[PDB]
Amino acid sequence: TKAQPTEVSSILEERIKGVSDEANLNETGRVLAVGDGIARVFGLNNIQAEELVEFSSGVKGMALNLEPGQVGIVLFGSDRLVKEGELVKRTGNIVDVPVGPGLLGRVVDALGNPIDGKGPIDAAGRSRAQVKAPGILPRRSVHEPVQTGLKAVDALVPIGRGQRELIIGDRQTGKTAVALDTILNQKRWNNGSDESKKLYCVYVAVGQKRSTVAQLVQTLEQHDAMKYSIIVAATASEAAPLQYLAPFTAASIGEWFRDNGKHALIVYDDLSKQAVAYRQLSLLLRRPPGREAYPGDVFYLHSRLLERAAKLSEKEGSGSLTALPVIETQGGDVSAYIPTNVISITDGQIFLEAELFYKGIRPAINVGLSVSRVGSAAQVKALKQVAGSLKLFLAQYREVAAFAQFGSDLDASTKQTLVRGERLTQLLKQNQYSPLATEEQVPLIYAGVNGHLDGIELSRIGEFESSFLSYLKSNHNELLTEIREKGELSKELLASLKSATESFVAT
Amino acid sequence: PPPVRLFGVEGTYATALYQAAAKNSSIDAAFQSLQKVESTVKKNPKLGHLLLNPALSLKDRNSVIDAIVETHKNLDGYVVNLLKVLSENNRLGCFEKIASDFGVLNDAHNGLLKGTVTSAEPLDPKSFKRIEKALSASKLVGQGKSLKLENVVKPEIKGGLIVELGDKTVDLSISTKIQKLNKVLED
Amino acid sequence: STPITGKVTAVIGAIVDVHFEQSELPAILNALEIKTPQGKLVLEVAQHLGENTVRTIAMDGTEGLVRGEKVLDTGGPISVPVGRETLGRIINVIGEPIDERGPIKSKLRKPIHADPPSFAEQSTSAEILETGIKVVDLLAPYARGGKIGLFGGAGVGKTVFIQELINNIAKAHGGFSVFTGVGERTREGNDLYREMKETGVINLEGESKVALVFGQMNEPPGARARVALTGLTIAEYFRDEEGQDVLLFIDNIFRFTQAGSEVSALLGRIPSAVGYQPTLATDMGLLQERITTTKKGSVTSVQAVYVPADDLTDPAPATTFAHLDATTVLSRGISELGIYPAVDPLDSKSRLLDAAVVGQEHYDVASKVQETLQTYKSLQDIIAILGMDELSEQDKLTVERARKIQRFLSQPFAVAEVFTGIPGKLVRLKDTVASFKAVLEGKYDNIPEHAFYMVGGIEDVVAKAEKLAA
Amino acid sequence: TPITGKVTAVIGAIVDVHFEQSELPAILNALEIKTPQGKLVLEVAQHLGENTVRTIAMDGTEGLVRGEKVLDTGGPISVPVGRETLGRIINVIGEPIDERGPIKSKLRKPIHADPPSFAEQSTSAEILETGIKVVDLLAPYARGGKIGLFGGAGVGKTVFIQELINNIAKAHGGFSVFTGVGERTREGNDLYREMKETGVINLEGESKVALVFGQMNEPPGARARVALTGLTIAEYFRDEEGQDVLLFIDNIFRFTQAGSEVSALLGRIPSAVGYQPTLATDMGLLQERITTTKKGSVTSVQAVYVPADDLTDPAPATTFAHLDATTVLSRGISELGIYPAVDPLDSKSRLLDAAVVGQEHYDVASKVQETLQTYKSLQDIIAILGMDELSEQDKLTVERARKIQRFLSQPFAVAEVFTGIPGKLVRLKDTVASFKAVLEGKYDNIPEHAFYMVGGIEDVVAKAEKLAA
């Protein structure tokens, strides 16, 4: 006729003997199909959905498939430890993590075991893996900057507290490094005070090797920032269910900050590896797979994850979890299902192109496809004023530059564009491990936008930039203090700045 | 493991019945009671030979069971649990299937062997008896294992003979030899 | 009467199967409620699978479902509340008052499954809505009771375009509106709530000429599917029962397609082309058909569509492309050119444009525009390698006109006094036709190209010419 | 153990056993069916219940009669490790196929093993020089690093690796492992012969390289666990011996491939392309067992037979995650005749940082990258229209780049026969100098063919004189 889950001869023979489950199997159950890190147990007739089940081997496994046959418990364990016919005892808790403030300065695995061995985490709570995102009314509009100290990022795609902006681009083209820069620039406020201007930083690393993680902690400790950082990790070796569970519990850790009314930022590197994990999981729970083999409800999972970070209402303080998702594009193909899905969810794209890295633009940002929908709502007012036509110049530059290589005639007007354009691009470039304060990005951008750099030759632009900053540090340090303090350029500041630029453009 | 592993399509049910009632030791009894109800099922023509196939409810299926166990006051209790199982799984088409399968296992416990002597036409009884004797004499039939031998009419094979039993056969047929002859004179 | 008791049998994501009491199956499309520690989970009956075991789709999260959990039966299609006090409420999928101004003051309730109007009822209008947006007015006029369609890619300020429409037409028009957001981000949601609270279209004591159904993408895909249905019924109540005009807005309808696609797999339906639901056509059809101008009301839908990677070829956009009356395509390129509207004039096409509907002058003017631009596009290849060389004097004038027209179309939006900080400009249709007519005649071809850029009418173009002159 | 079973099914080389005992082998246990072919080793991978496990079969399944006796060996098969594994070639099961008779050993360690913890790690930073110019310039090796070579045969996968063995492993003093999964048998025999000749193995003398060889003729299931066996030998060196180790793996696409073959049979819905849904996890386990712990530094080299050079195929993609340096070698650049055929715009290392190789090196490399990228960018324009229809600035750039491309050609020493050109070895310090000059166009004034197939800057000059004559 058909296969039935009660066909299993041991279950079946008990039924013939008039022996029944006896309701012990309302809370216990006997493993009977296991292997592939996925078990299906017969029993557990009462069992919360999404519950954590303590396997008698001793592993913990969440339960994601409930069938009138055999409830499918995705193991977090290792196969070799597990054996068939085992009893499983219900944890009785839907998946939950310890959440607190003591996570600062800790690398922790998914189940929150400090894998850096800093010993017990001072966790002020436990939370649940999925927590519904706050309401429409429970949000407050975003206006507070988030700055990476990279002129191209800040100027072109300004990020605000409580926004989701997608870093997208070709795999391991130091994708991570763009994000790490954000953490580094968050040193300035963090070291300082003003709680709402502090972003505690939670770096989530999914699918990455221990060596990568170790390098990251080494860099963070080198730049002494590990103190305000939390590292939630789920290395490549660690179970596919644990990898799947890792972002949603990272979110919970973030929510403790957000809920507390404090502002924080969560880096999700790489969501692409979450998708692979959920793919493995889904295909071994044997639900029919979605296109590109990624499950049919991959969007629902990813969408719920991303929408749990934002800036809350004044009622709820206005603590903002800010998110930076990071999606690897395999061969730079954004038509791929996982990239398409994410693009819709997010509030910005920070498109990176590999070719431009080789072209020498580093950080290599594909500024045409880089957008921030929210945009300059949260951008610093001074920086908003200066970079107003930066977009226009660049956009014009893009069109003109294309024409110039197709052997069309070039006039002085095009070569004005060409000269201006070249300098701007060179101005943008910045070396890794060097975030720059807004007070010292505003002058440079003023100089460029007010066209003084056009005069200065392309080769020595880097020299000019360095020296100019030194000159302002020496002399116009009053000017710098004002930009820092008032964050707007008054007429006096604009004139002062113009004069200052002229004096240093005069060497 | 219990003698003869069949594990048919819903024959895992038969296996279960066999081993469970084998340890009850009431397999002959079970088999007999199952036969008796199976026969009265076969001799029940409206339903269970005209609603052998399901379309019934769980509750209605159960009530069909209740009438079935109403007919027999000797019906063991393992096959009353088997009836329950069949009701619960809502299979009734595999009622005779299980009966046949349990029968194979049962007659394995008995040690009865089966055979067949297909021929074109049905043959002499003297030949049947001589062959039955021969087969029992031969090591092919073991001692403590009985022989059931069925001559069948298989006009599909014209002439020839095949002796079959214990999945080991001797085929002295006309067709194969003709085939071989033909083939060799096409060489 | 007695709620049919059901016991959960399988929680397999959104699909939750229930085992209702024998000899009584809650009919397909009914609504089951399961009291849960978090509200009542609503399960919509979507199949019967045999022996009083149904397979139903969840409309809320499936955490903490205990196998064999008692399931009450409401007994019929998910019935939301409708009224005129539904205006100015945020109402979720199962009709909850997530307005957070407390319980909606129900008049009547209606099911969210309703059969689309008959051929006989449908009466085809031919009247012209006008938005005052130059591109819209000249090259794709909108029509009362229309089914306008904002095809475009990712984040082309899709919401922003809709906001501009709400700013102009909704505030102006006396009819009701229904704002439906399907899988809208909660960032976008908070802005919309705030924005229409600010514009007073939601007046916190006063009457509201809009209702809100904000569907959040975090809500399960199943719930996302029936955000649309909910919105339709509110519109139906207005269209029919209140007998008024409406002005429906849905966002983004690719999410509606996408939502159905997700649950298709779970429903066990074999994947169709590009993994879409095989019921793609009929589901689209039910939505689209429901929106119409009957003998009774008239409903003007404006439906946003997200076209993945601007592949309109993609079957889900292509199916929607047919079903919508007045297509408008907003291309990325045009955005990049700095032209806001992002409306690609060549690709935006509406069959409402006719030399009868908008008269011979409007048509002829627009015909000249269409030719001019198409020529300009053709000439782009020549200009690319050869440059302005092989080009005729006539061609040069056409190129100059095309650039002027290209930047004459550029007009600031009122809702981009924040996203661009330039005062919005709305120019009446007759005035736009006249102003464009002048340009084509070349009466203002002595005006600089940048003096057409991002300004309104001819008076404004001239003024910006004066500004540049100074 | 007297735990026995019978063979219920033999569906491919994914045999199914029916344990008739109520004691059941655990997952990743090993079973021996004793055959007239010797033994067959099977490894439990699923329990399908009803006391029927489903077992991967390490050797061929030709001739198996259903119901045949299974006997349980228990646990992961434990290979034998030691200094007496140095200079031995061992079968997948572990039997010495180099026939120095049974390898006596102290410790036999299970093939399956857990990867070292996040706590147990040591971050390397030490450059390891190769003497190959292109490698030195673009993506130098590092001690303990995981370096990876992408591109199939069509670069002569083995040839690149052989150069590495010839250079790096003659100056490495610690132990070294070559584990070759699906290695074509003659090439393997050549390697063994060469190793004995270059004394890295001496069969009366000492050895300091050990070998695991899995031929591509070996049944897919065998190929799946060749890698894990090698990793065990490596763990003994890394951990127990503590001595620094090298490791070469050729070819780990074959490792994935073997997995992909078994996956269908195992009973898995095959994920994208065809790769096993457990592809990521499997890759994870292997590549986290080769890490540089506080107990030892293991420099690992991975060779990926990229199927038709589609990096978008998921298996090459998942390799990228576990590598800290890559040197993708392109078929196109091979057609250009450049040996080494490394694509220069598709090479990367984490060791290309300016504080690692020094700012001057980084600046030098930067200019090369920009120049070559321009050259690639103008390939369209160059083909459609001549180079004399390019800009004056550009034609110089193009001419410089044409020289750089030819300059990258260094005669190979292991392919000295095949190239027919005597090999070269060029110091890293020398390399920086040579490129510095070329970038300043100092010696750019002589034939582009003079830059072709030569070593250092000095050699180019001399060969220009040779060409001039």
Tab-separated table of N, CA and C in Angstrom, chain C residues 1 30 47 56 62 143 159 162 174 178 257 272 299 307 366 381 387 405 422 453 462-463:
chain	number	residue	atom	x	y	z
C	1	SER	N	-21.647	25.314	15.747
C	1	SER	CA	-22.179	25.314	17.134
C	1	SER	C	-21.112	24.806	18.049
C	30	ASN	N	-11.728	27.447	5.287
C	30	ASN	CA	-12.344	27.854	6.533
C	30	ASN	C	-11.236	28.409	7.381
C	47	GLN	N	-6.597	22.052	2.354
C	47	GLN	CA	-6.795	20.786	1.700
C	47	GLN	C	-7.537	19.951	2.683
C	56	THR	N	-3.521	22.472	6.571
C	56	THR	CA	-3.899	23.846	6.724
C	56	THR	C	-2.611	24.622	6.763
C	62	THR	N	4.708	29.230	14.506
C	62	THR	CA	4.352	27.855	14.779
C	62	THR	C	5.135	27.325	15.945
C	143	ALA	N	-6.185	56.800	-15.161
C	143	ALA	CA	-7.581	56.827	-15.477
C	143	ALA	C	-8.293	56.427	-14.261
C	159	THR	N	8.478	52.803	-2.698
C	159	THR	CA	7.646	53.339	-1.667
C	159	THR	C	7.569	54.827	-1.839
C	162	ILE	N	5.096	55.862	-4.425
C	162	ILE	CA	3.764	55.643	-3.919
C	162	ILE	C	3.408	56.761	-2.983
C	174	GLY	N	-11.641	62.918	-2.670
C	174	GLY	CA	-12.602	62.815	-1.614
C	174	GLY	C	-12.874	61.389	-1.273
C	178	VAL	N	-7.043	52.823	0.515
C	178	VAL	CA	-6.669	51.713	1.340
C	178	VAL	C	-5.215	51.557	1.073
C	257	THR	N	3.386	37.366	-4.830
C	257	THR	CA	3.734	36.223	-5.627
C	257	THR	C	4.669	35.338	-4.871
C	272	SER	N	7.082	25.102	-10.505
C	272	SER	CA	6.806	25.493	-11.865
C	272	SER	C	8.013	26.294	-12.267
C	299	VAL	N	-12.502	51.518	-8.121
C	299	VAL	CA	-11.378	51.318	-7.256
C	299	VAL	C	-10.225	51.544	-8.152
C	307	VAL	N	10.844	43.765	-9.514
C	307	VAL	CA	11.104	42.995	-10.679
C	307	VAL	C	12.487	42.557	-10.384
C	366	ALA	N	2.722	64.010	-27.707
C	366	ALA	CA	3.347	62.861	-27.135
C	366	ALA	C	3.963	61.982	-28.168
C	381	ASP	N	24.359	54.801	-30.052
C	381	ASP	CA	25.398	53.950	-30.593
C	381	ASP	C	26.354	54.697	-31.488
C	387	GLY	N	30.732	59.757	-32.400
C	387	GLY	CA	30.559	61.051	-31.775
C	387	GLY	C	29.631	61.841	-32.628
C	405	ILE	N	14.381	67.700	-23.205
C	405	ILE	CA	13.193	66.974	-22.820
C	405	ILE	C	13.510	66.032	-21.711
C	422	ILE	N	14.361	69.516	-2.194
C	422	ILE	CA	14.071	70.485	-3.217
C	422	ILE	C	12.575	70.614	-3.133
C	453	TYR	N	16.586	71.185	-16.193
C	453	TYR	CA	16.833	70.226	-15.144
C	453	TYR	C	16.124	70.520	-13.851
C	462	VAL	N	12.122	78.744	-17.562
C	462	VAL	CA	12.497	80.078	-17.935
C	462	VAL	C	13.133	80.741	-16.766
C	463	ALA	N	12.567	80.543	-15.561
C	463	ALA	CA	13.086	81.119	-14.349
C	463	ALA	C	14.451	80.582	-14.021
